[PDB]
Amino acid sequence: MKTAALFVSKEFEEEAIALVEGANYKVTSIYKLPKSPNVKFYIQYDKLQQIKNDEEISTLIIFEQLKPRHFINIRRELKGKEVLDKILLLLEIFALHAGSKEAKMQIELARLKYELPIIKETSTIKFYKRRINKLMKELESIKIIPSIGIVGYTNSGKTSLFNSLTGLMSPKRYAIPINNRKIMLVDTVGFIRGIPPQIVDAFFVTLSEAKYSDALILVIDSTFSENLLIETLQSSFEILREIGVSGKPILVTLNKIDKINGDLYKKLDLVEKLSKELYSPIFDVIPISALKRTNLELLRDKIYQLATQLS
């Protein structure tokens, strides 16, 4: 699968890793951001030469926003190989999770707009503007078996939960048998922290596809402190309300419970009380560990029972 070299601060590293893997890349090396960025290449020239020539690295990913002159100079050196900055990386995540025409158009619109400052730093300008104006036109004119979508913040364990259920394309939709029922599991885009303003519409439109699913599984990191757990739940439900999720059963899975080292039953009871205060109908609230495979038979049985309720 595609291999990336990732440059990222330690502060963002864990989050960036989980973003790069949501864009279908394996992170094969990781470096801090440069202390004093190179004026032409951002990263150091010798590192750039190594990545240019390394057949096991398909892609350079820089978790920052690059200036145009950096794109121009990096893309030349890489001769073919792709560079993504933080904007282009999140637009890649969206492209891999979007199945609707409107989201595909917003993603392509955002990519085109991002390329304009690069071209201007390099006829081609007018060509891009005509495509951007056509998409904006059409967007404005759009304006006027059970499927279970998995939602939740980045790094809550959504891919691990999907993979666990499926035993494992884009968008990711995969049917599984449970007892005598066939259920469509759907990899919805995560709630992303810190979305750059340029891509907020592409994000929301892609995420709004979650309303196509008959029910949702909301995945919550149990290792979070009580106050952070509360905040994560309050934002998760605030986002779902605002994108127009209404009346869908939601199964909340409190995940990574192997890593708590703490009071699981108090977390679970907090989550369950707050979730039902914030939303109806909550199908249920269960603790699991998708990595350690704890309570996976419960998670299976609850998905079957939801699938039966829906049918």
UniProtKB/Swiss-Prot annotation:
Pfam families reported in the protein's UniProt record: GTP-bdg_M (PF16360), GTP-bdg_N (PF13167), MMR_HSR1 (PF01926)
One Gene Ontology term of the molecular function aspect: metal ion binding
UniProt function note: GTPase that associates with the 50S ribosomal subunit and may have a role during protein synthesis or ribosome biogenesis. Specific for GTP.
Species: Saccharolobus solfataricus (strain ATCC 35092 / DSM 1617 / JCM 11322 / P2)
Name assigned to this protein: GTPase HflX
Keyword Nucleotide-binding: yes
Major site of localization recorded for this protein: cytoplasm
Gene for this chain: hflX
Effect of G190S: Decrease in GTPase activity
Source domain of life: Archaea
Residues bound to GTP: 152-159, 187-190, 255-258, 289-291
Keywords attached to this entry: Cytoplasm, GTP-binding, Magnesium, Metal-binding, Nucleotide-binding
Family to which the UniProt record says this protein belongs: Belongs to the TRAFAC class OBG-HflX-like GTPase superfamily. HflX GTPase family.
Result, substituting F191P: Increase in KM for GTP and in GTPase activity
InterPro entries documented for this protein: G_HFLX_dom, GTP-bd, GTP-bd_M, GTPase_HflX, GTPase_HflX_N, GTPase_HflX_N_sf, P-loop_NTPase, Small_GTP-bd
Domain Hflx-type G, first and last residues per copy: 146-311
Cofactor: Mg(2+)
